[PDB]
Amino acid sequence: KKYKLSEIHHLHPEYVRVSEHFKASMKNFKIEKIKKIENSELLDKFTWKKSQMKEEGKLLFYATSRAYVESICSNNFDSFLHETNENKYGKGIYFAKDAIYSHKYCPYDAKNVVMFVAQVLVGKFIEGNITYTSPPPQFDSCVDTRSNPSVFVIFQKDQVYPQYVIEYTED
């Protein structure tokens, strides 16, 4: 295996931190588990890109089916997997600022939905549209709106590191 997926205790500070980020928008939900992802290959690609970009990472959300957890932990997120926005802001990977946004735009049955926490190098962003296969020149990502974006579109895997998987159920 290319990675490790490790369950974190609920009193661990990383659990507390992730739980607070998730619960800021996921009010009618209970966290069942939080697992830490370790993939050295994906981390080295990310840390190199972070170094070249000279940007700090942003903690963003990606809701998906439990069936895809292993594919993401070993090979990173797949741009060929779409959500219900249907590439409206560019043909790339969609990461939400608020966990509730990724959850509501996830097309899978609630019982099968898990929440990824990803470190994302958004850099300079601009509004995207369906025709973009790259951000416009001098930009690193695309968004729904430049002021208070709700979603970020990433066109390169090395700008993302999957960091946590959250298991949860609706109240």
Decide if 135 contacts 90 (C-beta within 8 A): yes
Residue 59 tokens read as 């903690």
Biggest CA pair distance of the chain: 45
CA distance 79 to 94: 8
The torsion angle over the Cα atoms of residues 168, 100, 86 and 135, rounded to 10 degrees, is -110
- Token pair recorded at residue 82: 């779409």
Q: Fill in the amino acid letter for 103.
A: H
First to last CA, the chain: 35
Ramachandran quadrant class, 86 (left: phi over 0; alpha: psi -120 to 50; beta: rest): left
Look up tokens 């219900």; give the residue. Answer: 84
Q: Are 131 and 78 within 8 A, CB to CB?
A: no
φ/ψ (deg, to 5) at 31: -75, 125
Bridge partners (DSSP) of residue 141 are: 125
Residue 6 gets the label, from left (phi > 0), alpha (psi -120 to 50) or beta, of beta
* Residue 52, H or E segment: helix 40-53
**Residue 53, helix vs strand vs coil:** helix
3-state secondary structure of 65: strand
Alpha helix stretches (DSSP H) within 54-153: 69-75, 99-104
Tell me the C-alpha to C-alpha distance, in Å, between residue 168 and each of 35, 102, 143: 12, 14, 27
Write down how long the chain is.
171
CATH T-level fold of 1-171: Phosphoenolpyruvate Carboxykinase; domain 3 (3.90.228)
**Across the strands, what pairs with 162?**
118
Structure determination technique employed: X-ray
- Judge whether 153 and 92 are in contact, CB under 8 Å: yes
Phi-psi region of 119 (alpha: psi -120 to 50; beta: other; left: phi over 0): beta
Burial of 50 (0-12, 13-18, 19+ CB in 10 A): middle
Q: Which of 149, 2, 22 is nearest to 72 (CA)?
A: 2
